[PDB]
Design a protein around this ligand. Structure first.
Ligand SMILES: *C(=O)[C@@H]([C@@H]1N=C(C(=O)O)[C@@H](S[C@@H]2CN[C@H](CNS(N)(=O)=O)C2)[C@@H]1C)[C@@H](C)O
Length: 265
């Protein structure tokens, strides 16, 4: 039983686990705590890049953005190397997705603009995709820090899976912008030990990860079978029982994905 297995994993890792795979032709939806709120963490960067792509001509990607010392306030493996020179919007999108750069996300939020440093417009984008659940309230690093239970900066496995489905598989973006978003997620460097680890090598995996305080570890993916059948997989977890400093546990997501992969194979 799938639900029994997910509950076992929760006891093993002293964690709360959320899983959603939308229904397809012949497979029913997989759901475990799928309508419970979990912090976005860095998973919001996937729809953020889509929002920025949608809002502008494609050659906005070539616009240079400048920033400084006081702009580096969170984990930013790329933006710290380029503070002296600046980064184009395209470079910022690449870094936000592939390295989960926090400063890049902040700069992209500012580019989208409006109240709350871009967070209201970000939420507005999700609303336009029929998501009435998710909300973004703060930027990096505050968005990862809300107490367990707090609804600020949250999505649900269910809501984020439906958003990602429209972005990658549906027609939320035109084909050329859709391909840019897909390729970046395909070239993600942070996801090897999460959903990727649960699926056989001949299945294609594209993803965006999230990690935060209270043992928070997320992964949202689109996967393709060897025969080109796509599936959207959302896995979210936290470990509130360990407090603010609870270690995130990638292995939980890898195990949960393995259980998902077994059903879809
Ligand atoms: C988003 O959730 C934050 C940012 N994103 C992360 C992610 O995994 O999505 C990390 S980035 C980086 C990848 N793992 C590194 C830790 N090294 S370790 N412990 O050996 O795996 C961190 C980071 C939290 C947010 C800052 O934007």
């Amino acid at each position: 039983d799938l639900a029994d297995r997910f509950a076992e994993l929760e006891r093993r890792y002293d964690a709360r686990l959320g899983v959603y795979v939308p229904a397809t032709g012949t497979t029913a939806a997989i759901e475990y705590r799928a309508d419970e709120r979990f912090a976005f963490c860095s998973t919001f960067k996937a729809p953020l890049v889509a929002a920025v792509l949608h809002q502008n001509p494609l050659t906005h990607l070539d616009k240079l953005i400048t920033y400084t010392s006081d702009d580096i306030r969170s984990i930013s493996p790329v933006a710290q190397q380029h503070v002296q020179t600046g980064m184009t919007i395209g470079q910022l999108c690449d870094a936000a997705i592939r390295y989960s750069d926090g400063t890049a996300a902040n700069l992209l939020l500012a580019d989208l603009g409006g109240p709350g440093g871009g967070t209201a417009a970000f939420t507005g984008y999700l609303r336009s995709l029929g998501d009435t659940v998710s909300r973004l309230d703060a930027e990096e690093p505050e968005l990862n820090r809300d107490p367990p239970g707090d609804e600020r900066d949250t999505t649900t496995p269910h809501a984020i899976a439906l958003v990602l489905q429209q972005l990658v598989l549906g027609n939320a973006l035109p084909p050329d912008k859709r391909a840019l978003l897909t390729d970046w997620m395909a070239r993600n460097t942070t996801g090897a030990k999460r959903i990727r680890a649960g699926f056989p090598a001949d299945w294609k995996v594209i993803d965006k990860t999230g990690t935060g305080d209270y043992g928070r570890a997320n992964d949202i993916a689109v996967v393709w079978s060897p025969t080109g059948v796509p599936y959207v997989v959302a896995v979210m977890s936290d470990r509130a029982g360990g407090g603010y400093d609870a270690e995130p546990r990638e292995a939980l997501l890898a195990e949960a994905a393995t259980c998902v992969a077994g059903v879809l194979a």
